[PDB]
Amino acid sequence: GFELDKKLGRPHPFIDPTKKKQIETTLTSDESWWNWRKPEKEQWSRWQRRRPDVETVFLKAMAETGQVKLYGKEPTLTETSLYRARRHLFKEERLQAERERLAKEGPMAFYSEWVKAWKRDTSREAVQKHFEETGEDENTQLIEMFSHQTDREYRIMMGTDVRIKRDPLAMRMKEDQIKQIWGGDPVYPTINYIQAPDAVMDFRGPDFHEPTPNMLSYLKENCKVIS
């Protein structure tokens, strides 16, 4: 357990739970000065919620997958800073795992994730059977499979580009996890901001002043200038 995970760098508490002590009993607000007393009622702060960020979402995803383990369910700010310091190593581990999976399964099985219209069996044994029965080798079958891929699916698959190398954790991350990067839906609805790109401004709307009268016509209307 401890004293070995700490040596090897495996996930472990910063403070050993066995070598841990409580902080005894402190002042009870009856033996304390007025300026050091806890308020009777909790005070609204506007800082009472923890700020959302990328680190929290990625740490929660990695704790779900078991790559790292945290002290509790929600990563702390210390853990968030540590992840920000060491975040490239875990992404490299995920990328290497994806490369190993590609090498093991084969191109047909690996890239069929982004070709949903392909219903044939994509295992290496099935590919070899198809080659023996039809004479179409693995490359021909691969070209045939990519002929059913859509442009949306192809653009999603570009995260596997050897030059892009998108994080596999981010590629498979779901919308509910992604929204927590910025904290979810804004309380003020965006529909108030949205305007059509071809919209023509209605100058008789509720947000406009009354139509500006012609100055000469306004003077003549009030009977100030004769014809």
Binding site: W34, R37, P39, Q43, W47, Q48, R50, D53, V54, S81
Partner: peptide
């Protein structure tokens, strides 16, 4: 998100807000 606030700003702002409320 490259503009990095230190992790302890929210802790310190709340502490200063609590002392300003008491005084």
């Amino acid at each position: 998100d490259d503009l990095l606030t230190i992790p302890s700003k929210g802790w310190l702002v709340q502490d200063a807000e609590q002392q300003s409320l008491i005084l």
